[PDB]
Amino acid sequence: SELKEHYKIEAFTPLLAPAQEPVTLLGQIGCDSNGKLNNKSVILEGDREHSSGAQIPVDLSELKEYSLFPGQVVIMEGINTTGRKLVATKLYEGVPLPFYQPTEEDADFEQSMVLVACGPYTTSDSITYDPLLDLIAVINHDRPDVCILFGPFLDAKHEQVENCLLTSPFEDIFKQCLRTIIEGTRSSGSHLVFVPSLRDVHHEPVYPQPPFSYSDLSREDKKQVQFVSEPCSLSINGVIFGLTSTDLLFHLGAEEISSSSGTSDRFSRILKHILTQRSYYPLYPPQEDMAIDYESFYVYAQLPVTPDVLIIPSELRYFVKDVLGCVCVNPGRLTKGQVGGTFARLYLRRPAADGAERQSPCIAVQVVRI
Amino acid sequence: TDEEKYRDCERFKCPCPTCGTENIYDNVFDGSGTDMEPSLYRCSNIDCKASPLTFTVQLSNKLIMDIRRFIKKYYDGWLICEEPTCRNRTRHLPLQFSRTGPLCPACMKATLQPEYSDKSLYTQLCFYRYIFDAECALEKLTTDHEKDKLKKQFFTPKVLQDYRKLKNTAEQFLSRSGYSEVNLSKLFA
Amino acid sequence: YPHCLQFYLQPPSENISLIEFENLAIDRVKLLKSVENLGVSYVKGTEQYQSKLESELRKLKFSYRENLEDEYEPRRRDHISHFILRLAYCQSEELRRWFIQQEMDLLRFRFSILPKDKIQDFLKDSQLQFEAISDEEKTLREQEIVASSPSLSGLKLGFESIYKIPFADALDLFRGRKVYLEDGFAYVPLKDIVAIILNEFRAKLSKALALTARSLPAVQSDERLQPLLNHLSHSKISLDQIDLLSTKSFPPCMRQLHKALRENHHLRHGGRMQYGLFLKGIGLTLEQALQFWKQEFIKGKMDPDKFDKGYSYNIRHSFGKEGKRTDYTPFSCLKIILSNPPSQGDYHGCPFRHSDPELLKQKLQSYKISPGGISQILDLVKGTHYQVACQKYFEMIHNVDDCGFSLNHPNQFFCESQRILN
DNA sequence: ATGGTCGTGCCGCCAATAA
Numbered sequence A: 001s002e003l004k005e006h007y008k009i010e011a012f013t014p015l016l017a018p019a020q021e022p023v024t025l026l027g028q029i030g031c032d033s034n035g036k037l038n039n040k041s042v043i044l045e046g047d048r049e050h051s052s053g054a055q056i057p058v059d060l061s062e063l064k065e066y067s068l069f070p071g072q073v074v075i076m077e078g079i080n081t082t083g084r085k086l087v088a089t090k091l092y093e094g095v096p097l098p099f100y101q102p103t104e105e106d107a108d109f110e111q112s113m114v115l116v117a118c119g120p121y122t123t124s125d126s127i128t129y130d131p132l133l134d135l136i137a138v139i140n141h142d143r144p145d146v147c148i149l150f151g152p153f154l155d156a157k158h159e160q161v162e163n164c165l166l167t168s169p170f171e172d173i174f175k176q177c178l179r180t181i182i183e184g185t186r187s188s189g190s191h192l193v194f195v196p197s198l199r200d201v202h203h204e205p206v207y208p209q210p211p212f213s214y215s216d217l218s219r220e221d222k223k224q225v226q227f228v229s230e231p232c233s234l235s236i237n238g239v240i241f242g243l244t245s246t247d248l249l250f251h252l253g254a255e256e257i258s259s260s261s262g263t264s265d266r267f268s269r270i271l272k273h274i275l276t277q278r279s280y281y282p283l284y285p286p287q288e289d290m291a292i293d294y295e296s297f298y299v300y301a302q303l304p305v306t307p308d309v310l311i312i313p314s315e316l317r318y319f320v321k322d323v324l325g326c327v328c329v330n331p332g333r334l335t336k337g338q339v340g341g342t343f344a345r346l347y348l349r350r351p352a353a354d355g356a357e358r359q360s361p362c363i364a365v366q367v368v369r370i
Numbered sequence B: 001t002d003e004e005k006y007r008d009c010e011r012f013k014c015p016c017p018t019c020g021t022e023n024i025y026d027n028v029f030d031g032s033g034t035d036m037e038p039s040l041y042r043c044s045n046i047d048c049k050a051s052p053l054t055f056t057v058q059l060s061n062k063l064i065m066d067i068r069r070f071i072k073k074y075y076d077g078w079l080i081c082e083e084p085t086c087r088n089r090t091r092h093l094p095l096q097f098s099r100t101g102p103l104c105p106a107c108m109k110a111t112l113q114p115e116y117s118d119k120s121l122y123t124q125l126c127f128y129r130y131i132f133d134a135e136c137a138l139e140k141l142t143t144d145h146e147k148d149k150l151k152k153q154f155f156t157p158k159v160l161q162d163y164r165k166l167k168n169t170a171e172q173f174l175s176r177s178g179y180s181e182v183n184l185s186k187l188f189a
Numbered sequence C: 001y002p003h004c005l006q007f008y009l010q011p012p013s014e015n016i017s018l019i020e021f022e023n024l025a026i027d028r029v030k031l032l033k034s035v036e037n038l039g040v041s042y043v044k045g046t047e048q049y050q051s052k053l054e055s056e057l058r059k060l061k062f063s064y065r066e067n068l069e070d071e072y073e074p075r076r077r078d079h080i081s082h083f084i085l086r087l088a089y090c091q092s093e094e095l096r097r098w099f100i101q102q103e104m105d106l107l108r109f110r111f112s113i114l115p116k117d118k119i120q121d122f123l124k125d126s127q128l129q130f131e132a133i134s135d136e137e138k139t140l141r142e143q144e145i146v147a148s149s150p151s152l153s154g155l156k157l158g159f160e161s162i163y164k165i166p167f168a169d170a171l172d173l174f175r176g177r178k179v180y181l182e183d184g185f186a187y188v189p190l191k192d193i194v195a196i197i198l199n200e201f202r203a204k205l206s207k208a209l210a211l212t213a214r215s216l217p218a219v220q221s222d223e224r225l226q227p228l229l230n231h232l233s234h235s236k237i238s239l240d241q242i243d244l245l246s247t248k249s250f251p252p253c254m255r256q257l258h259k260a261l262r263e264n265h266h267l268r269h270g271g272r273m274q275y276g277l278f279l280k281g282i283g284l285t286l287e288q289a290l291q292f293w294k295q296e297f298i299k300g301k302m303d304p305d306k307f308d309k310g311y312s313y314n315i316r317h318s319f320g321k322e323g324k325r326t327d328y329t330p331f332s333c334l335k336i337i338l339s340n341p342p343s344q345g346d347y348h349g350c351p352f353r354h355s356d357p358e359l360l361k362q363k364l365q366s367y368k369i370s371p372g373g374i375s376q377i378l379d380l381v382k383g384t385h386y387q388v389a390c391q392k393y394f395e396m397i398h399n400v401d402d403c404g405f406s407l408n409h410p411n412q413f414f415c416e417s418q419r420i421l422n
Numbered sequence D: 001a002t003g004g005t006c007g008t009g010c011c012g013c014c015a016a017t018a019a
């Protein structure tokens, strides 16, 4: 409906209704088998109001440019004469939601720093947590303003986790991991935002994941330690940061097709697709191993407004890019097996309200390896 | 009965931290009559002198992995065709629904059923809760004298505390997330 | 807000645990059943009736007199209990009237206990639109009201207040010329307002019950609520020990038939004939046989007319009281083994023959049969030696080395068992 | 004061054989 109002489309057509004249269809892209999606096997599954949940194959031969992944909601213009196959003629571009409107109070603030680190915080064969230790040292030396720590603090793929060779419960392992940072960052005085990850073995394996539970916090610590669920959209100094721990880049780009491969930017097009589908996880169906509860997916996994900065850790290469006027940052993991990873630090201020509309508050980003 | 309800449940397995021999926990106690001793008292290996009750951390940790495996298996969403001739197994949930439920995409006349029903998950969770619930295991005895004899010989306050720790490890998952909650609004409105 | 009496509308929206879900239903059933006993054994005006009913209401944590503020818990209890019980007693027409009569009686009791002066606000809190009259208005129309009064003796207009109602709502009164009508408004004594309140409650209760029954198939889809919707009306030789004999003296076949009748509240034709003839064999007469069958079939939510014109003829004929008047002998074990093989939906036949070992094993297990005896019985069954296996079953359940007889008839089984047991 | 074949709703009647 939002895309219909944006593009001023008169009406939609059911999938099963034949039509010689070109018509516009509304549906979701999907695959007809359990294998990898290909251009030949793309099907469109319609809405229940119009198509009563039907599915028809689509032909992309007559389409100049396209980029499709399962679970994407688009409006497809094409011809469906026999009522069993739809041939494309034009594919509508996704329309992102308008940016957040800054208030007059947000424009009176000063320079702000956001340091971002993502798990794991140890090498893949040792438990000394030395990457966590020198990360805390870097935090102390930096004296930043906000410190966003993503999971997995206790990785579900660490070989000692599944061999049950430890002498302490992961519940207690959570307490020592917390108090490590807690007494390591007291001198810095920076706010701490701990966001869980789906790889947190000790916590509830539900996407979205609830905020962590911890009671051993002093009065000073409660003013500096804040627990935020995963995923979430947090306003830091009037800037909407989209915090997510899922490797959404690997969720999407691993099962997405495109028409151009010579000169095209991949990470940018996945980021655009994420920003245009108005959800934290458009992929339907997901891969083999990740649990999502759909009941709260509709109410806790959508974009209220388009976030000004996206923080999307991934196992792929680190990158900071401006897509659709939004600065997306991918610092990756702090530790990658036996080779070190990267973290990020971002500058943010609110410029003058007047100007050429769009003005990115986060002018500067710097991803540095730990 | 409890025996028939938990027959299909997978038995909880956990290696011994000392000797490595796999143990068996199918009930709170093992044996019958006078030799009805707790399953957590001694290791299954005869030569092993280490008490599994001491290794409560490892037992709870292995329970954690087992329950995570089960819940991920449930959320996998695997569906199976009811027709013996079709036996269609798909991960994608079709939007074509019949009166009973989803309609198979391979054969046009059949109802897809979940591979792991919610009843199976709840029964497995209840079995895990019951195998470490000494409170209901002690009241099951018909004689108070035998109950006191078994309580004062092994069920020390520390032993009861460890059993309650296992029960609370189960109850953390069984407490808020559930199935026993019935919404009256959906039932009436 | 006056949580001590309430017209039941606006269904709730809270969520509860299933244990409380069953506890509320059983408590409401118990209270509503005891209302029957109180209304039958006593009369509606004695102090003992009020005392017993209010004591029981106190016992089961249910709302009563409004003088002590925050009894929110009893309010919630009653509100949930009525709606949860609406689903069960809306199926059969023999239960809807039973529900309505006793709920109206309970509302009458709750109405009689309101002290004197909180009644006015309640009438506005139930969407009734009634009114009272001041003392000067009462004195103005005193003669008119007492003249318009019913056969109520005396001219004394007592302290009982007079209520002012729209005329259309007083149809049962002004039709008989028993009230006063002025400017399209009826004036009634406080005694008669109870009748109109209950009469107006009855129609809404019946409408709600009807509208719930037709949209109740959607609720049966839930597998956790099936026991509740079907077991709220469940539960020389006499009637009150046969169940015990099912565990003690019956052979496995007839025990299986009795279990089927106890659980499913119905039986097919073969099981009916077999069990009825055996039950004649043990010694029952016609009267208690009819009692037993009708009691076991009414619990299937069928009215007695259907049973009387359907099965009574066959039951009577089984004993030889119609037709040629021929009395029959209970089935011999050979015909049970060889004649009329069972099918799907049927529970008759010999378990030692028709039941596969993959089911016969747990059939023995559920009856506390020793594993060695189980193996011996399975070996005997594999050898097609059924009677000796049944004899071995008898010995194992009777704790004797040898029975001392040759078995060819279940009635012989029962008589031999009762020879030693009694 | 044509033939036969098919289904639907009311009733009454029967099987059984140790000890």
Ligand code: SF4
Pocket (backbone or CB within 6 Å): C251, C252, C253, C254, C333, C336, C337, C349, C350, C351, C352, C386, C387, C390, C409, C410, C413
């Ligand atoms: S052998 Fe005869 S008496 Fe025994 S269970 Fe079978 S039918 Fe019944």
Ligand SMILES: [Mg+2]
Pocket (backbone or CB within 6 Å): none
């Ligand atoms: Mg019949």
Ligand SMILES: [Zn+2]
Pocket (backbone or CB within 6 Å): B016, B017, B018, B019, B020, B021, B043, B044, B045, B048, B049, B050
């Ligand atoms: Zn051992």
Ligand SMILES: [Zn+2]
Pocket (backbone or CB within 6 Å): B081, B082, B083, B086, B087, B088, B104, B105, B106, B107, B108, B110
């Ligand atoms: Zn099929």
